Structures are given as C-alpha cells and as structure tokens.
Amino acid sequence: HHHMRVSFMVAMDENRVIGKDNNLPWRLPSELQYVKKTTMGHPLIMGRKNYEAIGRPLPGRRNIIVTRNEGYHVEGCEVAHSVEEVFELCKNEEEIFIFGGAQIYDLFLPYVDKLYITKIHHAFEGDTFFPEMDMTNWKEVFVEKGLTDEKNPYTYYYHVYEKQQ
Ligand SMILES: NC(=O)c1ccc[n+]([C@@H]2O[C@H](COP(=O)([O-])OP(=O)(O)OC[C@H]3O[C@@H](n4cnc5c(N)ncnc54)[C@H](OP(=O)(O)O)[C@@H]3O)[C@@H](O)[C@H]2O)c1
Ligand SMILES: CCc1nc(N)nc(N)c1C#CCc1cc(OC)cc(-c2ccncc2)c1
Ligand code: NI
C-alpha cells in the first residue's frame, strides 16, 4: 500500500543492545558521521523517547516524532501518532529512515525493506534491545569495517541488507 522505501537505521552490540538508561552505551563519533552521511536529506522517524534524548531537531532532514500523545508539539518537528499517519506524511518520499528506539523498531518491523545495521564487537551493559529478525529472503549488499582509533575505541562493521521479497 505504501510506496516509500522503509529503511531501518540502527547500531547494536553483539547481544543486540542499543541503549542503556535512556542513552547510548558507547561513543563512536565516526559511526555517527556515517549515520549523518547516509540519512542526509531523508526523513528520520523517531520514537518520542529517542527524540527527547537527542534533544533537538536534526538539520537537513524532516524530523518525525512518533507518540500516542495527541497534544504533543515540538518546534521544527512533525508529530505522528501511528504507522499509517507516518505513511500519510511520507507518501511522496523516496526513502525514510526508522531511527529508533526499540518500541518504534518493533512498530515498523513488518514494513522494513532495507536494513542499515552497524554491529559493534563488544558486549555492553544495556536495557534496550533491537528486535530479532528473520533474514530469510534478505541479502547483504554492503559490508565495511568501521574506523577504530583513539577516538573510536571499539571494533564494529557497517552492514546493509535488502529485502528481496
Ligand atoms: N543504538 C541505536 O541505533 C539507537 C537508536 C535509537 C534509540 N536508541 C536508544 O533506545 C532507547 C529508547 O528506546 P525506547 O524503546 O525506550 O523508546 P522509543 O522507541 O524511542 O520511544 C517510545 C515511545 O514511542 C511512542 N510509541 C511507542 N509505541 C507507539 C505506538 N504504537 N503508537 C504511537 N506512539 C508509540 C511512545 O511515546 P509516548 O510515551 O509519548 O506516547 C513511547 O513512549 C534509548 O536508550 C535510546 O538511546 C538507540
Ligand atoms: C549514533 C548511533 C546510531 N547509529 C546508528 N547506526 N543508527 C542509529 N539510529 C543511531 C542512533 C541513535 C540515537 C541518538 C541518541 C542521541 O543522544 C542520546 C543522539 C543522537 C544523535 C547525535 C548527533 N547527531 C545525530 C543523532 C542519536
Ligand atoms: Ni587507527
């Protein structure tokens, strides 16, 4: 029914941890640069909790916040209250990025066409997890090692998977 490409944008560790105490468990400025590079000029779909942790609209992108709160408003952001409302707001977009967190990844999981997933080779303490996925009829179309240096202290890889079906 929907004609935009629904892409997940996520970074997780070896046990699918994405968050700890409503924040990121790691700092990888280089990984964040990849995110900015890949998401330039495309809508970001964010769970209300994800957005409020970020704290500000991200520039050069439509910021869409998913909440059940019908009175929720943020300057410089758009507000949606369901998957279908997001689809209406984005009906003419080429590609949208589901930017997290876990509740929002769960929400859009039946509709995901493309997965941009960074895998971090470390086991962090965490409380928030990326959902399990069946990768039947998906294919890895890109893989590259991330930059590990004094400012990026973990090993990690960028992966891109595309749904065939
Ligand atoms: N590593 C990564 O790639 C990454 C990415 C993003 C986030 N994170 C982390 O993940 C954590 C946040 O994830 P989270 O799951 O706790 O929160 P979240 O998914 O970002 O947002 C949860 C909120 O989304 C709204 N929501 C949930 N289901 C909805 C529905 N069916 N319809 C309309 N609105 C709905 C609700 O807002 P209301 O309560 O206002 O109704 C809910 O409280 C943080 O630790 C964050 O740092 C990590
Ligand atoms: C950067 C990891 C990340 N990597 C990947 N591959 N996908 C993601 N969805 C996220 C993520 C996230 C959630 C997130 C939380 C946050 O503070 C708590 C700040 C940002 C952010 C800071 C500066 N420019 C833009 C965004 C993003
Ligand atoms: Ni180095």
UniProtKB/TrEMBL annotation:
GO biological process: dihydrofolate metabolic process; folic acid metabolic process; one-carbon metabolic process; tetrahydrofolate biosynthetic process
CC annotations in GO: cytosol
GO MF term list: dihydrofolate reductase activity; metal ion binding; NADP binding
Protein origin, superkingdom: Bacteria
Top-level enzyme category: oxidoreductase
UniProt xrefs under CDD domains: DHFR
EC numbers for this chain: 1.5.1.3
A Pfam family matched in the record: DHFR_1
UniProt domain DHFR: residue ranges: 5-163
Residue numbers binding NADPH: 11, 18, 22-23, 48-50, 67-69, 101-104, 128
Pathway stated in the Swiss-Prot or TrEMBL entry: Cofactor biosynthesis; tetrahydrofolate biosynthesis; 5,6,7,8-tetrahydrofolate from 7,8-dihydrofolate: step 1/1
Residues noted as binding Ca(2+) 1 in the record, renumbered to the chain: Y111, D113
UniProt record similarity statement: Belongs to the dihydrofolate reductase family.
Protein's UniProt name: Dihydrofolate reductase
